[PDB]
């Protein structure tokens, strides 16, 4: 019953720690602590935040976003090339905080961000957290 967060990022100035970016059809850059996405239009870019080693299971995941477009989340096991989608997510001008459950049925070692319209619309992401617990159950570490 100890929930384990993981805290992938809270400000960024690169890539995560223990991570690489598997997406396509986007540019990062970094400003504000914020990881910024611009897809290329036609695209349907993404990023996929990809483990260097090891997975997670089942949790929530914790983090903020604003973005001019509509956002899809998933999640993907990289060995049973399995994508799950999590949630997809209404333009938003400012950041809101979103704590989701992954109810995939398997382990997971990258997180996905894409710009759904295929649009070219940015994405703005800070405070990424998983947790093996539930999203009701989640107590933020960040706001604490």
Not at 124 to 136: F, P, Y
């Amino acid at each position: 019953v100890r929930a384990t967060y993981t805290v992938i990022f809270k400000n960024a100035s690169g890539l995560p720690n223990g991570y690489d970016n598997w997406g396509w059809g986007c540019t990062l850059s970094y400003y504000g602590g914020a990881m910024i996405i611009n897809p290329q239009e036609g695209k349907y870019g993404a990023v996929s935040l990809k483990r260097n080693s090891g997975s997670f299971r089942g949790g929530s995941l914790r983090f903020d976003m604003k973005n001019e477009g509509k956002v899809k989340i998933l999640v993907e096991n990289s060995e049973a090339d399995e994508k799950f989608e999590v949630e997809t997510i209404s333009p938003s001008d400012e950041y809101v905080t979103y704590i989701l459950d992954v109810d995939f049925d398997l382990p997971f070692d990258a997180i996905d961000f894409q710009d759904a319209p295929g649009n070219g619309d940015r994405i703005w992401i800070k405070n990424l957290v998983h947790s093996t617990g539930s999203a009701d159950d989640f107590v933020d570490p960040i706001n604490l």
